[PDB]
Structure 1
Amino acid sequence: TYVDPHVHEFAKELDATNISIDKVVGAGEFGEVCSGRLKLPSKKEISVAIKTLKVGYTEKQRRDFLGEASIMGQFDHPNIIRLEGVVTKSKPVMIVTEYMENGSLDSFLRKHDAQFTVIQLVGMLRGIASGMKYLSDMGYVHRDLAARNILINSNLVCKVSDFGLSRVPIRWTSPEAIAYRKFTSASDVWSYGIVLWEVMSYGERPYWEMSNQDVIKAVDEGYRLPPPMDCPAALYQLMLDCWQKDRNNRPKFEQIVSILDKLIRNPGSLKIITSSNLLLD
């Protein structure tokens, strides 16, 4: 079980002598983002992502910044970004996480439109579902599950990131969560359906640039995102199931993992294909 903080309980204090910065990767919400190397206590050296808190931060910025680490540090799963530790006893304050060579999944897929096999895409999707199954098992609702918040490593393994918004983005949010803030693991399953569409669409924006008001109304009326080009029937059906109006009828993450595993095991089933406008379901 996840425990809501809203920390040294769940984050290791790293010695900065063990951190080296290699590359600066622009700015983040709270400070700079870079990558580098971390020397572990066993002397092994690994690549890491490093984020710092800006000079002259406010106490609220510090709390929000480190709050993400206190959440991430609760999880230890191959499809959830690993927290290596924090530096708080010296400034700038830092959060150190596993390095992901290929960055955010949506921007990565946009660079490689139609360049992966359907089995490669399903492998990515299975990793994301496995990470979500763990988070939901822990009682955590993500609330911001989207391809931009999944990171992908050199071996194409996808891992859930960005713990800033959840606890024990209209296009990605379930209708009930929009209507009255009913956030549950089933609203994360809705979001997963959107990520499934993003992946199969190679990082197309869900609902493109539709007015937010129209995204809300259309989805409420029963309209759904259309099948991506050449989308396996099984995967479009999975999207539709994740997008059931009644949250009790959506699959659980465990079922999603199971569905994907069966597709990986019988790849011929992916050969059955479905045949900027929404479809009435």
Structure 2
Amino acid sequence: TVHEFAKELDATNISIDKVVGAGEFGEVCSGRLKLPSKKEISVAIKTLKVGYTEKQRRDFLGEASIMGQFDHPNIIRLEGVVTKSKPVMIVTEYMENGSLDSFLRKHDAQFTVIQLVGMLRGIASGMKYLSDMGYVHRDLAARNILINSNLVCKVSDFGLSRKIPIRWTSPEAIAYRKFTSASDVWSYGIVLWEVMSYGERPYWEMSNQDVIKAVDEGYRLPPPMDCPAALYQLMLDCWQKDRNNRPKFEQIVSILDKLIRNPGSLKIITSNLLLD
């Protein structure tokens, strides 16, 4: 049933080169995969730890069942699964520069605005496809965006793979679990702020109850330093209280494409939370 959405890979074609992360029930590694065409590519490899239960196997492979449904340049690519041998494995494309928030923090103010908008456009395009497919992410955050050696950004849910993430969640989803593509659009607004602020934490370390209350009262994150007015306005639109008034992802992609094609528009800039 995982094989409905995931190719079975022969473990003979996989080399594990490094353990990258580990937990109580599994590990994340990097390595190489030899494709049926004999081409070899870099991959990430999730393995279950030796001695796992059948239910752990089922839950583990459930992740690949979901991932394999999405084939898009800006969504993490599932290469396949290993189920016929042990340990069971999930194999994905390798994203050399890791999570976007931590990457941008290492490079504060070192990219052009156009480069940043390129990243954001990729993220929007992956989300447009996810929402087209009827899938609500619910965990969209810069930490769950993976960025490769060419700065291409891909939607993942590394977080879940590794409670409501309050800082990234729309008011109605916090209030009563109303998760829709419009709540993902709210989350995308926060990612937009994270990118333009080079990986600053949304709402910093405010008490969660105050994040909920402030946003409910109408307060919003302030424009990042030197933020293009167009991009801050886009944040505010993603953060409309009325979920029906938020832009669709297709509109977001369109807006970002227009800005990329006409960079001059990004020279108009804005000038703890803001009400007005």
TM interval, shorter chain, is over 0.9
The answer to whether the 8 A contact 1:142-1:165 is kept is no
What's the % identity of the aligned pairs?
100
CA drift of 1:28 comes to: 4.7
Q: In the aligned structure 2, how far is the partner of 1:254 from the partner of 1:128? A: 12
The answer to whether the 8 A contact 2:143-2:159 is kept is no
Q: In the aligned structure 2, how far is the partner of 1:61 from the partner of 1:134? A: 30
Tell me: CA distance 1:60–1:219, structure 2 relative to 1, closer, same or farther (3 Å).
farther
Q: In the aligned structure 1, how far is the partner of 2:260 from the partner of 2:53? A: 48
The alignment's C-alpha RMSD in Å is: 2.2
Match in the other structure for 1:4: none
Q: In the aligned structure 1, how far is the partner of 2:165 from the partner of 2:69? A: 24
Match in the other structure for 2:254: 258
Q: In the aligned structure 1, how far is the partner of 2:67 from the partner of 2:28? A: 17
The answer to whether the 8 A contact 2:7-2:79 is kept is yes
CA drift of 1:24 comes to: 1.5
Instruction: Report the more deviating stretch, 124-133 or 65-74.
Output: 65-74
CA drift of 1:63 comes to: 2.6
Structure 2 unaligned residues grouped into runs of 5+ = none
CA drift of 1:65 comes to: 1.8
Tell me: CA distance 1:52–1:61, structure 2 relative to 1, closer, same or farther (3 Å).
same
Q: In the aligned structure 1, how far is the partner of 2:155 from the partner of 2:257? A: 19
Match in the other structure for 1:60: 55
C-alpha offsets along residues 237-279 of structure 1, whole Å, 9 cap, x if unaligned? 00000000000000000000000000000000000000x9100
CA drift of 1:64 comes to: 2.5
Q: Name which of 48, 63, 67 aligns with 1:72.
A: 67
Match in the other structure for 2:45: 50
CA drift of 1:59 comes to: 3.6
Tell me: CA distance 1:166–1:103, structure 2 relative to 1, closer, same or farther (3 Å).
closer
Q: In the aligned structure 2, how far is the partner of 1:12 from the partner of 1:28? A: 25
TM-score (normalizing by structure 1): 0.94
Q: In the aligned structure 2, how far is the partner of 1:14 from the partner of 1:69? A: 13
C-alpha offsets along residues 203-256 of structure 1, whole Å, 9 cap, x if unaligned? 000000000000000000000000001000000000000000000000000000
C-alpha offsets along residues 106-152 of structure 1, whole Å, 9 cap, x if unaligned? 01001000000000000000000000000000000000000000100
C-alpha offsets along residues 1-42 of structure 1, whole Å, 9 cap, x if unaligned? xxxxxx110000100000001122121574111111100001
Question: Is 1:94 the equivalent of 2:116?
Answer: no
Q: Name which of 179, 182, 189 aligns with 1:183.
A: 179
The answer to whether the 8 A contact 2:182-2:244 is kept is yes
TM-score (normalizing by structure 2): 0.96
CA drift of 1:68 comes to: 1.3
The answer to whether the 8 A contact 2:185-2:246 is kept is yes
CA drift of 1:58 comes to: 3.4
Q: In the aligned structure 1, how far is the partner of 2:109 from the partner of 2:187? A: 23
C-alpha offsets along residues 153-211 of structure 1, whole Å, 9 cap, x if unaligned? 00000000117869990100000000000000000000000000000010000000000
Question: Is 1:169 the equivalent of 2:155?
Answer: no
Count residues in correspondence: 274
Tell me: CA distance 1:254–1:166, structure 2 relative to 1, closer, same or farther (3 Å).
farther
CA drift of 1:89 comes to: 1.2
Q: In the aligned structure 2, how far is the partner of 1:165 from the partner of 1:174? A: 18
**Displaced runs of 4 or more, over 4 A:** 163-168
- Secondary structure at 2:158 match in 1: coil
Tell me: CA distance 1:29–1:265, structure 2 relative to 1, closer, same or farther (3 Å).
farther
Tell me: CA distance 1:169–1:224, structure 2 relative to 1, closer, same or farther (3 Å).
same
The answer to whether the 8 A contact 1:83-1:97 is kept is yes
Tell me: CA distance 1:198–1:180, structure 2 relative to 1, closer, same or farther (3 Å).
same
CA drift of 1:62 comes to: 2.4
- Secondary structure at 1:12 match in 2: coil
Tell me: CA distance 1:219–1:9, structure 2 relative to 1, closer, same or farther (3 Å).
same
Tell me: CA distance 1:28–1:230, structure 2 relative to 1, closer, same or farther (3 Å).
farther
Q: In the aligned structure 1, how far is the partner of 2:24 from the partner of 2:77? A: 20
